[PDB]
Scaffold this active site. Structure first.
Site, mmCIF file in Angstrom:
data_model
loop_
_atom_site.group_PDB
_atom_site.id
_atom_site.type_symbol
_atom_site.label_atom_id
_atom_site.label_comp_id
_atom_site.label_asym_id
_atom_site.label_seq_id
_atom_site.Cartn_x
_atom_site.Cartn_y
_atom_site.Cartn_z
ATOM 1 N N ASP A 19 8.966 -2.565 -34.022
ATOM 2 C CA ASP A 19 8.543 -1.182 -34.221
ATOM 3 C C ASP A 19 9.644 -0.384 -34.916
ATOM 4 O O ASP A 19 10.793 -0.348 -34.451
ATOM 5 C CB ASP A 19 8.174 -0.544 -32.876
ATOM 6 C CG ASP A 19 7.162 -1.383 -32.108
ATOM 7 O OD1 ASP A 19 6.034 -1.543 -32.591
ATOM 8 O OD2 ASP A 19 7.481 -1.906 -31.029
ATOM 9 N N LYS B 26 -6.197 -7.760 -1.684
ATOM 10 C CA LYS B 26 -5.963 -8.829 -2.653
ATOM 11 C C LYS B 26 -4.538 -9.355 -2.551
ATOM 12 O O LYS B 26 -4.304 -10.568 -2.633
ATOM 13 C CB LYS B 26 -6.278 -8.352 -4.073
ATOM 14 C CG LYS B 26 -7.778 -8.056 -4.285
ATOM 15 C CD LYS B 26 -8.105 -7.708 -5.738
ATOM 16 C CE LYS B 26 -9.616 -7.666 -6.011
ATOM 17 N NZ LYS B 26 -10.354 -6.772 -5.064
ATOM 18 N N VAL C 24 -1.129 1.478 -5.462
ATOM 19 C CA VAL C 24 -1.706 0.409 -4.654
ATOM 20 C C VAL C 24 -2.522 1.069 -3.549
ATOM 21 O O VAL C 24 -1.968 1.665 -2.619
ATOM 22 C CB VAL C 24 -0.641 -0.542 -4.085
ATOM 23 C CG1 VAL C 24 -1.312 -1.690 -3.326
ATOM 24 C CG2 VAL C 24 0.252 -1.092 -5.199
ATOM 25 N N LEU D 241 3.256 1.879 -1.922
ATOM 26 C CA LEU D 241 3.589 2.345 -3.256
ATOM 27 C C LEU D 241 2.392 3.061 -3.880
ATOM 28 O O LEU D 241 1.239 2.696 -3.633
ATOM 29 C CB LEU D 241 4.014 1.179 -4.133
ATOM 30 C CG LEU D 241 5.094 0.323 -3.483
ATOM 31 C CD1 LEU D 241 5.282 -0.981 -4.238
ATOM 32 C CD2 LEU D 241 6.372 1.113 -3.443
ATOM 33 N N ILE E 64 -9.488 -8.527 -32.518
ATOM 34 C CA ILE E 64 -10.637 -8.794 -31.663
ATOM 35 C C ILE E 64 -10.352 -8.116 -30.327
ATOM 36 O O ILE E 64 -9.370 -8.452 -29.657
ATOM 37 C CB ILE E 64 -10.892 -10.298 -31.505
ATOM 38 C CG1 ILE E 64 -11.025 -10.961 -32.889
ATOM 39 C CG2 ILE E 64 -12.138 -10.544 -30.678
ATOM 40 C CD1 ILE E 64 -11.476 -12.407 -32.849
ATOM 41 N N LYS F 212 0.816 -1.210 0.000
ATOM 42 C CA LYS F 212 0.000 0.000 0.000
ATOM 43 C C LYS F 212 0.853 1.264 0.000
ATOM 44 O O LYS F 212 0.388 2.320 -0.446
ATOM 45 C CB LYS F 212 -0.945 0.012 1.203
ATOM 46 C CG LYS F 212 -2.121 0.963 1.011
ATOM 47 C CD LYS F 212 -3.067 0.918 2.179
ATOM 48 C CE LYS F 212 -4.310 1.695 1.869
ATOM 49 N NZ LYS F 212 -3.957 2.991 1.260
HETATM 50 N N1 V3A Z 1 -1.153 3.089 -24.811
HETATM 51 C C1 V3A Z 1 0.110 3.742 -25.172
HETATM 52 N N2 V3A Z 1 0.436 4.997 -24.826
HETATM 53 C C2 V3A Z 1 1.645 5.505 -25.202
HETATM 54 N N3 V3A Z 1 2.531 4.848 -25.893
HETATM 55 C C3 V3A Z 1 2.278 3.556 -26.285
HETATM 56 C C4 V3A Z 1 1.032 2.988 -25.925
HETATM 57 N N4 V3A Z 1 0.980 1.725 -26.407
HETATM 58 C C5 V3A Z 1 2.108 1.508 -27.020
HETATM 59 N N5 V3A Z 1 2.891 2.611 -26.995
HETATM 60 C C6 V3A Z 1 4.190 2.483 -27.565
HETATM 61 C C7 V3A Z 1 5.412 2.693 -26.619
HETATM 62 C C8 V3A Z 1 5.983 1.346 -27.240
HETATM 63 O O1 V3A Z 1 7.311 0.974 -26.702
HETATM 64 C C9 V3A Z 1 5.891 1.555 -28.586
HETATM 65 C C10 V3A Z 1 5.642 0.294 -29.299
HETATM 66 O O2 V3A Z 1 4.546 -0.350 -28.692
HETATM 67 P P1 V3A Z 1 4.506 -1.973 -28.494
HETATM 68 O O3 V3A Z 1 3.120 -2.471 -28.341
HETATM 69 O O4 V3A Z 1 5.131 -2.662 -29.665
HETATM 70 O O5 V3A Z 1 5.239 -2.308 -27.151
HETATM 71 P P2 V3A Z 1 6.802 -2.589 -26.834
HETATM 72 O O6 V3A Z 1 7.287 -1.571 -25.851
HETATM 73 O O7 V3A Z 1 7.678 -2.572 -28.087
HETATM 74 C C11 V3A Z 1 6.847 -4.217 -26.025
HETATM 75 F F1 V3A Z 1 7.839 -4.241 -25.114
HETATM 76 P P3 V3A Z 1 7.040 -5.605 -27.193
HETATM 77 O O8 V3A Z 1 6.699 -5.086 -28.622
HETATM 78 O O9 V3A Z 1 8.420 -6.094 -27.158
HETATM 79 O O10 V3A Z 1 6.066 -6.711 -26.812
HETATM 80 O O11 V3A Z 1 4.625 2.653 -28.791
HETATM 81 MG MG MG Z 2 6.770 -3.579 -29.867
HETATM 82 NA NA NA Z 3 -6.880 -8.669 -29.833
HETATM 83 NA NA NA Z 4 -0.657 3.628 -2.305
HETATM 84 NA NA NA Z 5 4.195 -2.758 -32.233
#
Ligand code: V3A
Ligand code: MG
Ligand code: NA
Ligand code: NA
Ligand code: NA
Ligand code: CL
Ligand code: CL
Ligand code: CL
Length: 326
Positions: free
Chosen positions: A183, A63, A56, A53, A97, A51
């Site tokens: 990416d 939980k 939390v 942190l 999906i 808690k």
């Molecule tokens: N909801 C959000 N708000 C702000 N930024 C967001 C975001 N979702 C993704 N991003 C991101 C940062 C990410 O490193 C980058 C690529 O997004 P990604 O989904 O590929 O995640 P990664 O950081 O590369 C994972 F570690 P992984 O691919 O190895 O599984 O754009």
């Molecule tokens: Mg990625």
């Molecule tokens: Na999906």
């Molecule tokens: Na807290």
């Molecule tokens: Na990606």
DNA sequence: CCGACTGCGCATCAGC
DNA sequence: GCTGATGCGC
DNA sequence: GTCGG
């Protein structure tokens, strides 16, 4: 890792709330807790300790208390046996999906992997390709394969125009020994905040990558964002590599540093940094950092010459990409 | 207590 | 066709 | 679900 039991539980709770309850703030709350506990450098021993942190609160504290006593959580176990929840959760694992289509498919009785293949006529394109490569996209990408994927992309990008810069971001840039996908940040100097001096700029790159059969499928594409599928070539007699998710973002070249900060993440780091930006009275996106006026209006883009400048504005010590894996 | 919670590209759908 | 809201994914 | 004012 140190508190894997607790963070796994909060992640399963986060997923339930997003996919099933469609409660996106509980999802974001659980993920924030899972993140701050994942970096907490002691082995948690009580709910009250946790808690302390931020992120939390009391509900998560109890939980954690139950989990540490029993090794499990009755809320989760009841959720794992509700067939509808269990089935919505599974459907959301197909790319394209989300919670809504996943629930839409329940009501029609489309519930297993087989049910999906049986009904491809009911899937949009993205959902179809996500089903096609469902098993491949569950596999992570060893960094050694990422290095080969980088060499193909950057070398093929150069053959279209040597003024393109392409930078691999995501977990790769953060030093991960494996990544979930690939990416790619793209810049070309005839596309700035001031003018689009060339059309097709991202198309030309996607085209070259399809011509050499690296990019194999397209989930979505537009003038600055491409999300699709790629595959490394294999050797004679050798099994094929899994197909891999690939995203390519074309960002205006004068906005490279905000783009590479965005695309390096992690998503929760980005969310934490932008939240802090707002406390300091700024707003950051993948293009600019701007002051918020006395009225909440975003102002004009501040000048940015480095990633670090963005940290300097919001009064954060600079963090190297490897230390942004929140 | 309670307003606010990060920010945005592309696909799709509704309504005109 | 356009616009704006929503789904989905980054 | 959490929390800062
Ligand atoms: N909801 C959000 N708000 C702000 N930024 C967001 C975001 N979702 C993704 N991003 C991101 C940062 C990410 O490193 C980058 C690529 O997004 P990604 O989904 O590929 O995640 P990664 O950081 O590369 C994972 F570690 P992984 O691919 O190895 O599984 O754009
Ligand atoms: Mg990625
Ligand atoms: Na999906
Ligand atoms: Na807290
Ligand atoms: Na990606
Ligand atoms: Cl919510
Ligand atoms: Cl910039
Ligand atoms: Cl902007």
């Amino acid at each position: 890792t140190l508190n894997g039991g607790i963070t796994d539980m909060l992640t399963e709770l986060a997923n339930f709330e997003k996919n099933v309850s469609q409660a996106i703030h509980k999802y974001n709350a659980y993920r924030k807790a899972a993140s701050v506990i994942a970096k907490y450098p002691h082995k948690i021993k009580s709910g009250a300790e946790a808690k302390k942190l931020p992120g939390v609160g009391t509900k998560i504290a109890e939980k954690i208390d139950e989990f540490l006593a029993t090794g499990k959580l009755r809320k989760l176990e009841k959720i794992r046996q509700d067939d509808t929840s269990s089935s919505i959760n599974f459907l959301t694992r197909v790319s394209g999906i989300g919670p809504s289509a996943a629930r839409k498919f329940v009501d029609e009785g489309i519930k297993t992997l087989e049910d999906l293949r049986k009904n491809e006529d009911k899937l949009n394109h993205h959902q179809r390709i996500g089903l096609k490569y469902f098993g491949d996209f569950e596999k992570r990408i060893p960094r050694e394969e990422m290095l080969q994927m980088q060499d193909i992309v950057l070398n093929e990008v150069k053959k279209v125009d040597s003024e393109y810069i392409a930078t691999v971001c995501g977990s790769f840039r953060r030093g991960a020994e494996s990544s979930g996908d690939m990416d790619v940040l793209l810049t070309h100097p005839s596309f700035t905040s001031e003018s689009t001096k060339q059309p097709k700029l991202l198309h030309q790159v996607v085209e070259q990558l399809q011509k050499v059969h690296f990019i194999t499928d397209t989930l979505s594409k537009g003038e600055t964002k491409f999300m699709g599928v790629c595959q490394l070539p294999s050797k004679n007699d050798e099994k094929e590599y899994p197909h891999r998710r690939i995203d390519i973002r074309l960002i205006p070249k004068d906005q490279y540093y905000c783009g590479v900060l965005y695309f390096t993440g992690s998503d929760i780091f980005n969310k934490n940094m932008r939240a802090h930006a707002l406390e300091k009275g700024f707003t950051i996106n993948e293009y600019t950092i701007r002051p918020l006026g006395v009225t909440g209006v975003a102002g004009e883009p501040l000048p940015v010459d480095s990633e670090k400048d963005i940290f300097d504005y919001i009064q954060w010590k600079y963090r190297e990409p490897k230390d942004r894996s929140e």
